[PDB]
Design an enzyme around this catalytic site. Sequence first.
Site, PDB file in Angstrom:
ATOM      1  N   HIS A  49       0.730  -1.239   0.000  1.00 15.21           N
ATOM      2  CA  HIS A  49       0.000   0.000   0.000  1.00 15.21           C
ATOM      3  C   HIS A  49       0.784   1.331   0.000  1.00 15.21           C
ATOM      4  CE1 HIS A  49      -3.588  -2.409   0.459  1.00 15.21           C
ATOM      5  NE2 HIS A  49      -3.101  -2.988   1.547  1.00 15.21           N
ATOM      6  N   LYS A  77      19.006  26.643 -15.805  1.00 12.71           N
ATOM      7  CA  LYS A  77      17.714  27.385 -15.636  1.00 12.71           C
ATOM      8  C   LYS A  77      17.189  26.951 -14.246  1.00 12.71           C
ATOM      9  CE  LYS A  77      13.328  28.569 -18.121  1.00 12.71           C
ATOM     10  NZ  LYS A  77      12.017  27.913 -17.777  1.00 12.71           N
ATOM     11  N   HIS A 122       4.408  31.514 -23.588  1.00 12.77           N
ATOM     12  CA  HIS A 122       5.071  31.650 -22.252  1.00 12.77           C
ATOM     13  C   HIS A 122       4.280  30.843 -21.214  1.00 12.77           C
ATOM     14  CE1 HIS A 122       6.321  33.842 -18.539  1.00 12.77           C
ATOM     15  NE2 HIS A 122       5.025  34.103 -18.355  1.00 12.77           N
ATOM     16  N   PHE A 123       4.959  30.179 -20.252  1.00 11.44           N
ATOM     17  CA  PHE A 123       4.276  29.425 -19.171  1.00 11.44           C
ATOM     18  C   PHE A 123       4.272  30.424 -17.991  1.00 11.44           C
ATOM     19  CE2 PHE A 123       2.747  25.357 -17.597  1.00 11.44           C
ATOM     20  CZ  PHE A 123       2.751  25.520 -16.207  1.00 11.44           C
ATOM     21  N   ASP A 124       3.086  30.868 -17.594  1.00 12.33           N
ATOM     22  CA  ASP A 124       3.033  31.863 -16.521  1.00 12.33           C
ATOM     23  C   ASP A 124       2.921  31.244 -15.078  1.00 12.33           C
ATOM     24  OD1 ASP A 124       3.197  34.802 -16.417  1.00 12.33           O
ATOM     25  OD2 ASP A 124       1.213  34.684 -15.469  1.00 12.33           O
TER      26      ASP A 124
HETATM   27  O1  LIG Z   1       8.642  28.525 -16.643  1.00 11.98           O
HETATM   28  C1  LIG Z   1       8.095  27.593 -15.703  1.00 11.98           C
HETATM   29  C2  LIG Z   1       7.750  28.412 -14.472  1.00 11.98           C
HETATM   30  O2  LIG Z   1       6.981  29.532 -14.928  1.00 11.98           O
HETATM   31  C3  LIG Z   1       6.498  30.376 -13.860  1.00 11.98           C
HETATM   32  O3  LIG Z   1       7.580  31.066 -13.206  1.00 11.98           O
HETATM   33  C4  LIG Z   1       8.396  31.841 -14.100  1.00 11.98           C
HETATM   34  O4  LIG Z   1       7.639  32.864 -14.778  1.00 11.98           O
HETATM   35  C5  LIG Z   1       6.901  33.612 -13.804  1.00 11.98           C
HETATM   36  C6  LIG Z   1       5.883  34.559 -14.434  1.00 11.98           C
HETATM   37  O5  LIG Z   1       6.548  35.645 -15.095  1.00 11.98           O
HETATM   38  C7  LIG Z   1       7.828  34.372 -12.858  1.00 11.98           C
HETATM   39  O6  LIG Z   1       7.065  35.008 -11.816  1.00 11.98           O
HETATM   40  C8  LIG Z   1       8.798  33.397 -12.210  1.00 11.98           C
HETATM   41  O7  LIG Z   1       9.803  34.158 -11.516  1.00 11.98           O
HETATM   42  C9  LIG Z   1       9.467  32.527 -13.261  1.00 11.98           C
HETATM   43  O8  LIG Z   1      10.286  31.531 -12.628  1.00 11.98           O
HETATM   44  C10 LIG Z   1       5.679  29.572 -12.867  1.00 11.98           C
HETATM   45  O9  LIG Z   1       5.181  30.386 -11.788  1.00 11.98           O
HETATM   46  C11 LIG Z   1       6.483  28.390 -12.348  1.00 11.98           C
HETATM   47  O10 LIG Z   1       5.619  27.590 -11.533  1.00 11.98           O
HETATM   48  C12 LIG Z   1       6.898  27.556 -13.549  1.00 11.98           C
HETATM   49  O11 LIG Z   1       7.635  26.394 -13.146  1.00 11.98           O
END
Ligand SMILES: OC[C@H]1O[C@H](O[C@H]2O[C@H](CO)[C@@H](O)[C@H](O)[C@H]2O)[C@H](O)[C@@H](O)[C@@H]1O
Lengths: 124, 118
Positions: free
Chosen positions: B12, B35, B113-115
């Site tokens: 488990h 990175k 972009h990943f925000d």
């Molecule tokens: O790129 C993966 C990460 O993206 C975010 O964080 C980055 O971009 C943000 C928005 O501009 C910035 O605030 C932050 O400083 C960067 O590291 C996200 O919040 C992370 O969870 C992701 O892993």
Amino acid sequence: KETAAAKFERQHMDSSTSPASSSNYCNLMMCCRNLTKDRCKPVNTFVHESLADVQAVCSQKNVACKNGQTNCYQSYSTMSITDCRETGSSKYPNCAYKTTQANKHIIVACEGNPYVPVHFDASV
Amino acid sequence: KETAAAKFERQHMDSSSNYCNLMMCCRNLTKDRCKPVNTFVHESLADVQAVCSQKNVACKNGQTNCYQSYSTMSITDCRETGSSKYPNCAYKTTQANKHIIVACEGNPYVPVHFDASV
Ligand SMILES: OC[C@H]1O[C@H](O[C@H]2O[C@H](CO)[C@@H](O)[C@H](O)[C@H]2O)[C@H](O)[C@@H](O)[C@@H]1O
């Protein structure tokens, strides 16, 4: 010059293959933990919290066990778990399972010294 | 005889790998520096691109072209370990299922972009 769209795919896209998808977690795990050697275990839950937090349940909410005993305990909090249960087409030795990730309270039976989990009774 | 306690752990327990170490390097994210953090999305490309048509939200930087996925998506967060040191980058891998937020642009309108994940 790499486009903004391709940079995003490069940095962030990794779609999983079918062999690597979570839906196959139970099939791999029920096999590697030896729960399909003699017959297909119908249902079995895996718990993803630390061992300390799971052992801690033996001192949490005392509840009746399904078999009638009273050495069962429910966690006060929900825990990340994965529920595995035999699909309708599963047939030993080709056992097959449906994988369901969830967050639920667990109920375990405890025994021994130290008093720790020895059976998994239910998730609720 | 395996103990009752050890049997319970075998049937488990599955508490909490070098996935981030390899991917950060295969995707050229450790070429001249490590990175610090990165996220990979395991849904199909089509489902990720569709997010640019889902919930419109403000980006962290205040832009208004961010989108949050209506559903949770399977992702993996990669975070630099404490010992990580270029050229020997090292990452902790954490899998999650969360909504993703991406900024989108272009024609076709796709993620650039990943925000964040929420
Ligand atoms: O790129 C993966 C990460 O993206 C975010 O964080 C980055 O971009 C943000 C928005 O501009 C910035 O605030 C932050 O400083 C960067 O590291 C996200 O919040 C992370 O969870 C992701 O892993």
